[PDB]
Design a binder for these strands. Structure first.
Length: 410
RNA sequence: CUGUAUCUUAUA
């Protein structure tokens, strides 16, 4: 008929009535409760809204599980809208419930049941303190389900909120690593080019690669930048990769002999498409005068193993000539690099890999290559036969013996 | 006589 404008009744003191709980540990307000910390069967989401107790159920285990279980899936339901409004009315209570050990799961349930309009409010809330939210053990999950579920421009706004932050500290963090990995394995590369610019620095790249957590995010970025198929047709990723692989190839020696950055070095040796050039460089720069020394290291011997696995003949041949005739025999013991790596706790593996590639390559098309692999393998056989009495007693020596009976020199 | 990681993937 006529206009009717309906202000909301205030409940200032009535919001404080939910502060009283049966338990010290439990946070469910006493009106909803068995007395055993479970929600009553008489409680309705409508009651939660009526009592203004969304935060208080989201802080409980059983109250939050109730919310997740009965939150409606369709975006046009009235209870869905009233609960979402109550969630996002206050930014501070939203970001507290994101940071809550139990409320995060409800924020994720909202993310699961979201449309584009709701995603806008959620993205603006997360953006205001994204860096600290993703540093938190609880919210980091919410941030990752955001990067999963959002529209790509909303997720890109979130990703770009990290543009000028302490990204070494976030990359090596036990929680933010998974966030950064999730971004680089999820969003298109334009959403996170600022990361690749960040690791154009040598020091940032070293401190992230020399970590159990940051080495895996560096692998995820490199594996994302390498996997294309639009060769020649433009080259944005190529330029990005290059600027990253520059440092890898410039600190290779250090990174390759590191507890964690070795995995990065072997990841670029294993991927033989866009990283092949870099694989070859890495071999040429840190490996190809240092094979004995690196095969005796507990970390670098794995890198030498995957280098023998994945190198091209041209380099495999220089590696083989290094081990067979590249070092001057010890002045006391009169033994070469091959003698040393046969009776080494780590080198043995390198020698086993040498055997493996010289048997796979014996079946190569180029006869010359087949002959060269055969005579390398023959040189290994002669040295193993002259040391077989001592090597037979070792597990590794037994693996070596049964590798060389399972060939055909032809 | 065999070799990296308490996340070779982490919240109720």
């Amino acid at each position: 008929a006529v206009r009717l404008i309906d202000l909301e009744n205030n409940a200032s003191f009535s919001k404080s009535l939910n502060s009283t709980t049966r338990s010290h540990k439990c946070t469910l307000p006493i009106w909803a409760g068995d007395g055993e910390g479970n929600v009553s069967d008489s409680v309705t989401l409508q009651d939660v809204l009526a009592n203004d107790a969304l935060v208080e159920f989201a802080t409980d285990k059983n109250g939050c599980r109730f919310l997740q279980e009965h939150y409606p899936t369709e975006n046009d339901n009235d209870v869905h809208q009233k609960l979402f409004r109550k969630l996002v009315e206050d930014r501070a209570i939203f970001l507290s419930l994101c940071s809550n050990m139990f409320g995060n799961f409800f924020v994720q349930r909202v993310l699961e049941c979201s449309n584009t309009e709701e995603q806008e409010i959620l993205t603006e809330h997360l953006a205001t303190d994204l860096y600290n939210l993703c540093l938190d053990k609880s919210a980091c999950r919410v941030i990752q389900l955001a990067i999963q579920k959002l529209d790509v421009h909303l997720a890109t706004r979130l990703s770009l909120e990290l543009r000028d932050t302490h990204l070494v500290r976030l990359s090596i963090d036990q929680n933010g690593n998974h966030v950064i990995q999730k971004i680089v394995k999820t969003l298109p590369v334009s959403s996170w080019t600022f990361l690749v610019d960040f690791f154009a620095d040598d020091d940032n790249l070293i401190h992230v690669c020399q970590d159990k957590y940051g080495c895996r995010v560096i692998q995820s970025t490199v594996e994302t930048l390498s996997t294309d198929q639009y060769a020649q047709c433009y080259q944005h990723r190529v330029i990005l990769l290059r600027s990253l692989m520059a440092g890898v190839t410039r600190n290779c020696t250090q990174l390759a002999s590191n507890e964690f950055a070795n995995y990065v070095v072997q990841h670029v040796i294993k991927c033989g498409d866009a990283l092949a050039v870099y694989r070859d460089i890495i071999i040429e720069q840190c490996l190809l005068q240092n094979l004995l020394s690196m095969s005796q290291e507990k970390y670098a011997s794995h890198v030498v193993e995957v280098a023998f696995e994945c190198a091209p003949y041209r380099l495999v041949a220089e590696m083989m000539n290094e081990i067979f005739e590249g070092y001057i025999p010890h002045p006391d013991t009169n033994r070469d690099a091959l003698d040393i790596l046969l009776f080494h706790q780590y080198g043995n593996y390198v020698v086993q890999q040498m055997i493996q590639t010289c048997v796979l390559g014996q079946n190569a098309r180029d006869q010359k290559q087949s002959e060269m692999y055969g005579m390398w393998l023959e040189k290994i056989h002669g040295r193993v036969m002259r040391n077989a009495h001592r090597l037979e007693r070792f597990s590794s020596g037994k693996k070596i013996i049964e590798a060389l009976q399972s060939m055909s020199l032809y």
